[PDB]
Design a protein around this ligand. Structure first.
Ligand code: NA
Ligand code: NI
Length: 122
């Protein structure tokens, strides 16, 4: 399983971005009842290719299973319309909306998607 850092609120995401400044970030939005989210874990995040590709990316996760007020605020703030959604932020903390993943992707497809991100080495 990937080693995600959990965030719950907008404030928490923003502080994680501040601390990640200098490395690219991936924010995975998850719920226990989200079938394609579980499929990401089974087929894609579990694949060494993907795991190694992500090794120099800070991985964040929001678990919105409850859909509580903080979850909803977070989704609204990110203009998320459904799950799964995966956002990508460059090493300056800027999100690139075209990089958003909003459906299941297998490991080869996801890997290719990672490759097409804004360059991120120093
Ligand atoms: Na990008
Ligand atoms: Ni890299």
């Amino acid at each position: 399983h990937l080693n995600f850092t959990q965030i719950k609120t907008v404030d928490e995401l923003n502080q994680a971005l501040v601390e990640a400044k200098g490395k690219p970030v991936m924010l995975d939005l998850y719920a226990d009842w989200c079938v394609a989210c579980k499929e990401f874990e089974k087929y894609t995040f579990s694949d060494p290719q993907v795991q190694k590709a992500l090794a120099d990316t800070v991985l964040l996760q929001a678990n919105v299973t409850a859909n509580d007020a903080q979850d909803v605020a977070l989704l609204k703030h990110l203009n998320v319309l459904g799950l799964p959604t995966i956002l990508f932020f460059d090493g300056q903390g800027q999100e690139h909306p075209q990089a958003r993943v909003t459906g299941f992707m297998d490991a080869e497809t996801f890997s290719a998607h990672l490759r097409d991100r804004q360059p991120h080495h120093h």
